[PDB]
Design a protein around this nucleic acid. Structure first.
Lengths: 24, 133, 158, 190
RNA sequence: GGGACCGCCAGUGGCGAAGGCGCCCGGCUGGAACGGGUCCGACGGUGAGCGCGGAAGGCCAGGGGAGCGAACCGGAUUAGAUACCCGGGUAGUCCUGGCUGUAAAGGAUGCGGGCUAGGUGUCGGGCGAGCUUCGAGCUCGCCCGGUGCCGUAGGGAAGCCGUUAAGCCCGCCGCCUGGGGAGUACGGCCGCAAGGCUGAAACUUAAAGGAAUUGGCGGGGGAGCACUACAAGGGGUGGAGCGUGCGGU
């Protein structure tokens, strides 16, 4: 549970920063 | 073998007691001559009979007969255990071997603690909860 | 008492003497005792250590209670006498000693490096000195134009 | 097994000027000169005295063997785990004195000594006690010959004495010579 | 020969602001309790901001590497194991220089003071004794500070708390105002990265939560009986044919 939320957020952020980095 | 003037050989009977097997080896006082080495596996092959106390009793008894031929009639008993990433407690053959010696007619004048206990520490295998089934 | 500032425990339970009636178990005069203070100050004693001496040797209860007043400055005891003579500098003895320690510490941290505990103590002593000084400059114990920075400290010490 | 045993040769422990000699302890080996460095534990059956009783285990190492009689010097003393763990206790202190002794006889000796504090109070008097333990053991050792000193050091005479002079400063109990290791032996052979 | 660490010692124990701190010896060095207030004479308290320390692991360089061991490669277990278990094994763990900053970093109890029943133990100091191995070695009381147990007035939803307050007061700081969306988005700021700080809205909901009571339950613990229980023992069904009832047909 607790682990889930955080890593999901860290994935959510790294995909978004990936989609920010390669479409500017 | 000449130049005996002790008039009663004595042998330091070594007992290595793993949870995975029991070995019983006897040497003279020096340690420089092995007369006997008998293990649980040589007695009986079945992987569970190997540390079993009955298997250990007979292994120690065999050695003990050889020792009597030699005129080894007194024994120091030196108990140790596995220790490098194992439990440091001696297995079942300790108690079995002491019994086979007591029946066998070899009298014990000392009981000796040469077991691995560090004052520098050693970690055994676990999984952050120890071993489990 | 009790306060906390670098300890997790209370302060000592000591109190001033209440023999607030003048001595008469002393058998020395005011005059003789002053005489002693000039000689001792001159010798190399600092004004706390003189007053301790006076209590033991000459047997007074307090030095606040055998020699107040005799000069018209606040809280008349030793260093006020000396101050009129010019045997005491204006910067209180308290402050002189604090400052001396604050110099001592920079020199150890250098030679002994990796001192965490000693480093926090250097910040803490210094910090306290600025706050004490800030009040003293105003009071006239220190000049108005004086400042406490750590270089000026080293100057005084040397 | 492997041998008759007659290929194995047996040799016999004698330790002139260490105990005056013994007749107990045997070392087998295969070939001559593989017994020159072997270490032999005896409790001693030539005496049933205090060495055997309360200072249980002594080690002797056969330095050289000449003509199939083995000349032997003091290799070590120790106690066992049974003694160290028994005597120590809780809400007290354990005090130990190491010194590296030089004796004027050409032997270098290392003593560990075991002193047990009389109950309460952990104090600088402990460490003061350690200063004294080293100094006393040194003076006894310095005066005497190595055969004399070994007999005093393994026996309670030394322990009993350390406890008397220390006891005056700060009382002790249960003083012992935990082990003695012969830092360096030789002075008559290289 | 080598690296690494210090069973006993070790105690409900001691030290440090805090994170934290355990082989032994010596030097260097910081802090504290206490008794004697000897000294300045209200210099005090709090403190937005700012500044600083900050376990472990991580990041960077160099060195060290004995054992241990993410990843990893087999084996078992398991339907399969993705896991518990076993055989090997790399970074890392160690040391120094450098860098980043988190914690259920807990006493979940902000900081400073006064005040409000006691009892007992314990650590160190002051003081008067007794015992004495003549050393505070063993102990008692008064007194001063700290850590513990039991408990009053009172407080609390209750559990508890109770001179170490969640008690009675005062000064100041930090913070909250249902749950999910979301500690997300967006922007800025810091960081080398990992991350950190700040920090929404549309929408959706009649509950989310805390304590205790009672009951059921638990490859949770302890104890005990039963012959409609199990063991021992004796016969039998499931085979075949028939009789009878049911499902299906």
């Amino acid at each position: 549970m607790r682990w889930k939320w955080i890593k999901k957020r860290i994935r959510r952020l790294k995909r978004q920063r990936k989609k920010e980095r390669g479409l500017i | 073998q000449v130049n005996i003037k002790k008039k009663e050989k004595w042998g330091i009977a070594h007992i290595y007691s793993s949870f995975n097997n029991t070995i019983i080896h006897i040497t003279d006082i020096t340690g420089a001559e092995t007369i006997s080495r008998w293990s649980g596996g040589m007695v009986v092959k079945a992987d569970r009979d190997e540390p079993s106390p009955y298997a250990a009793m007979l292994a120690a008894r065999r050695a003990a007969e050889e020792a009597l031929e030699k005129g080894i009639v007194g024994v120091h008993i030196r108990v140790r255990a596995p220790g490098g990433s194992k439990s440091k407690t001696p297995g079942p053959g300790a108690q079995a071997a002491i019994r086979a010696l007591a029946r066998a007619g070899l009298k014990i004048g000392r009981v000796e603690d040469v077991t691995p206990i560090p004052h520098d520490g050693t970690r055994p295998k676990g999984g952050r909860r120890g071993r489990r089934v | 008492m009790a306060r906390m500032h670098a300890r997790k425990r209370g302060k000592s339970g000591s109190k001033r003497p209440p023999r607030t009636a003048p001595p008469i178990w002393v058998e020395y005069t005011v005059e003789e005792i002053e005489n002693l203070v000039v000689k001792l100050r001159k010798e190399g004693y600092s004004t706390a250590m003189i007053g301790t001496i006076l209590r033991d040797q000459y047997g007074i209860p307090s030095v606040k209670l055998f020699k107040d007043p005799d000069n018209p400055n606040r809280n008349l005891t030793i260093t006020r006498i000396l101050e009129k003579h010019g045997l005491a500098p204006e910067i209180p003895e308290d402050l002189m000693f604090l400052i001396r320690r604050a110099v001592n510490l920079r020199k150890h941290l250098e030679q002994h490096p990796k001192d965490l505990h000693s480093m926090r103590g250097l910040q803490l002593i210094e910090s306290k000195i600025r706050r004490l000084v800030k009040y003293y400059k105003r009071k006239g114990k220190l000049p108005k134009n004086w400042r406490y920075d750590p270089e000026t400290a080293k100057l005084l010490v040397r | 097994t492997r041998d008759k045993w007659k290929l194995k040769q047996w040799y016999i422990i004698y330790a002139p000027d260490f105990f005056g000699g013994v007749e107990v302890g045997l070392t087998p080996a295969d070939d001559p000169e593989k017994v020159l460095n072997r270490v032999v534990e005896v409790t001693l059956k030539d005496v049933t005295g205090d060495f055997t009783k309360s200072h249980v285990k002594l080690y002797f190492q056969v330095y050289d063997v000449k003509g199939q009689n083995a000349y032997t010097k003091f290799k070590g003393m120790k106690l066992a785990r049974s003694y160290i763990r028994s005597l120590v206790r809780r809400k007290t202190t354990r005090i130990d004195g190491i010194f590296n002794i030089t004796t004027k006889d050409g032997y270098k000796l290392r003593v560990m000594a075991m002193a047990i504090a009389m109950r309460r109070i952990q104090t600088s008097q402990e460490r003061a006690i350690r200063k004294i333990m080293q100094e006393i053991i040194y003076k006894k050792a310095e005066e005497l010959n190595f055969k004399d000193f070994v007999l005093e050091s393994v026996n309670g005479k030394i322990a009993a004495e350390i406890a008397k002079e220390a006891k005056k400063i700060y009382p002790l109990r249960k003083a012992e010579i935990r082990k003695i290791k012969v830092l360096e032996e030789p002075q008559v052979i290289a």
